[PDB]
Amino acid sequence: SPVAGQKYDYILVGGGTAACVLANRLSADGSKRVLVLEAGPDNTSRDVKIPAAITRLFRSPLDWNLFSELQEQLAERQIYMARGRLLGGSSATNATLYHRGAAGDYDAWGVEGWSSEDVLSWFVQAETNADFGPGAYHGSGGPMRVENPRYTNKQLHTAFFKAAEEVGLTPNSDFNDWSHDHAGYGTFQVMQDKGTRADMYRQYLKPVLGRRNLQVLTGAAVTKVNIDAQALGVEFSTDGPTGERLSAELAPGGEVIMCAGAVHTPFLLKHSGVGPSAELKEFGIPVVSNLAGVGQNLQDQPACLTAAPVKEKYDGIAISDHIYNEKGQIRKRAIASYLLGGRGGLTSTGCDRGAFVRTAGQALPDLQVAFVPGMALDPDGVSTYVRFAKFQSQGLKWPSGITMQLIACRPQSTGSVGLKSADPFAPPKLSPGYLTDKDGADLATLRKGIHWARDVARSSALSEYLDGELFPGSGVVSDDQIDEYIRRSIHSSNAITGTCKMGNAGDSSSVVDNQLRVHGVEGLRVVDASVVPKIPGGQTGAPVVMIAERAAALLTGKATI
Ligand SMILES: Cc1cc2nc3c(=O)[nH]c(=O)nc-3n(C[C@H](O)[C@H](O)[C@H](O)COP(=O)(O)OP(=O)(O)OC[C@H]3O[C@@H](n4cnc5c(N)ncnc54)[C@H](O)[C@@H]3O)c2cc1C
Ligand SMILES: CCCCCCCCCCCCCCCCCC(=O)O
Ligand SMILES: CCCCCCCCCCCCCCCCCC(=O)O
């Protein structure tokens, strides 16, 4: 009906991070007709624009509300795995932390055309940085907005940096400068524009919407890719399960580009008969291409946390004191600094200072620390954000304190995504696989992370401010007690890469080639976090945008690869 008698040179499945970038580059010269299909709504919520309102996006109608299969190894728990559901995708709902990891992470892919020397200039092309001048590591011209966070907690941010130095860490002035070693303490830059979320809808898609060759449908859930093997286009509903199934057709030479993210791309490819035959057979799905790797190599960065209250003399100095009054009302001072100056607590996603640490002489840091100048009231950091949102207007005072989140940033465990039913509107079968690596390296990383965070809090610099420890608490002393606390509290830092991994020729574990072309289908590609062979250290948004920029340069003939 909206797609009736139309032919497309590109159909983008999903309108998320990578999709927004491609919708921009692919529709640029005007020759090519581009369709974007997004299950979620338009990007208009105020909870998207204001960074601190990330607290409200968790477990909201703008999230997929995904829960994992029971995890035997995690105290028999289902794990929440947040994913954005709207134009912009997870760039619209994330913590805005701007990280690339280290050159070593790209060299460790071992995929021809995709070394550190190859990807660098693509990071730079994407970026306008407010706080680093232009050079080999920073752009001044690209659609992304990157800045130093516009909120500083003068007492607790200073205390954390002094504490990190006190325990023997060196400062890193730029976690994204590949001439520096990745390890050290300092500030995480954010994907913000003077304290407004700079998601890839705002930066890439929204400025080019008036282009006549670009069509974008929202509330448009893709149920499968129509394949003949050669991609014909895709099927979708414009009213969810109980809505008419339409179909969208490629023009001659046209391609379907999968941009439904490391969770939904493999789910859709499987419902499209691409992935392991046995999984397909289980639900009477015809096998079009039998690929081992579809839904495999799920890499996510797991987290735990410590948290401590401030001494009574420091009541009122926390970010929670800057955002909420003693009755849980948003402070009129916070709203004013935000709207008049793009300053203050509402510009914060909380977790934008920290460190990369080697717990045991690894080639690259295994541990990322995110310091928060506010106290966790749930050992699950993501649950704490949900409760912080739900706390508003409850007539209660959030206690002043700090959190350190510990993230296994180069993890050795892998998980999977597959099918629980034949209904393409059914939640996928999600297994994060945290703490399954055979050497128990990921648990070792987080356990040593807890020891590190306790040394930092017991430092003279943080001892000044802190009064005891709430999580894990003085009950948790031995390494076995620490590991048990981790099993019970472990949560996502919300990466998720690797589920349609790219590989060299003659790697049967791979799903796409170095050109992002799906093995044994013609005119079908994947351009999202699915393709990352081995997850880099740090949050995964900037690497997705770098892959999208390079994919678009490839598709429009401006570069090889
Ligand atoms: C809560 C959270 C916090 C994060 N924090 C950070 C951080 O601070 N910094 C950072 O760099 N990274 C962060 N990340 C990760 C980062 O946001 C993602 O890695 C990146 O945005 C992935 O982009 P993508 O295009 O691969 O997927 P997405 O951006 O998730 O795009 C997938 C899109 O496909 C849509 N879709 C799914 N199924 C269908 C269907 N059937 N039909 C149509 N559309 C469909 C989804 O609704 C979504 O809009 C965070 C992630 C989350 C979820
Ligand atoms: C706890 C999470 C904080 C949520 C922030 C709520 C802010 C309340 C202000 C409501 C009215 C003023 C709106 C000002 C700006 C709204 C969006 C924008 O245009 O940037
Ligand atoms: C915004 C103010 C929050 C106050 C509550 C403090 C509790 C801290 C919990 C730990 C941080 C959770 C981060 C969730 C966002 C995901 C980002 C990431 O870790 O990559």
Swiss-Prot record:
SUPFAM superfamilies registered for this protein in UniProt: FAD-linked reductases, C-terminal domain (SSF54373), FAD/NAD(P)-binding domain (SSF51905)
Requisite cofactors: FAD
Any GO molecular function: lyase activity
Enzyme class label: lyase
Biological processes annotated in GO: glycine betaine biosynthetic process from choline
Entry GO terms, CC: chloroplast; membrane
pH dependence: Optimum pH is 8.5 (with palmitate as substrate). Optimum pH is 6.0 (with octanoate as substrate).
Positions of FAD binding: T17, A18, E38, L86, S90, N94, A95, T96, L97, V222, G541
EC number: 4.1.1.106
Use case: May be used in light-driven, bio-based production of hydrocarbons. The oleaginous yeast Yarrowia lipolytica expressing FAP from Chlorella variabilis under blue light conditions produces odd-numbered alkanes and alkenes, which could be used as drop-in biofuel.
Main location: plastid
InterPro entries found in the cross-reference section: FAD/NAD-bd_sf, GMC_OxRdtase, GMC_OxRdtase_N, GMC_OxRtase_C
Pfam families per UniProt: GMC_oxred_C (PF05199), GMC_oxred_N (PF00732)
UniProt key word Transit peptide: yes
Stated family: Belongs to the GMC oxidoreductase family.
Name used for this protein in its record: Fatty acid photodecarboxylase, chloroplastic
Organism name: Chlorella variabilis (Green alga)
This protein's encoding gene: FAP
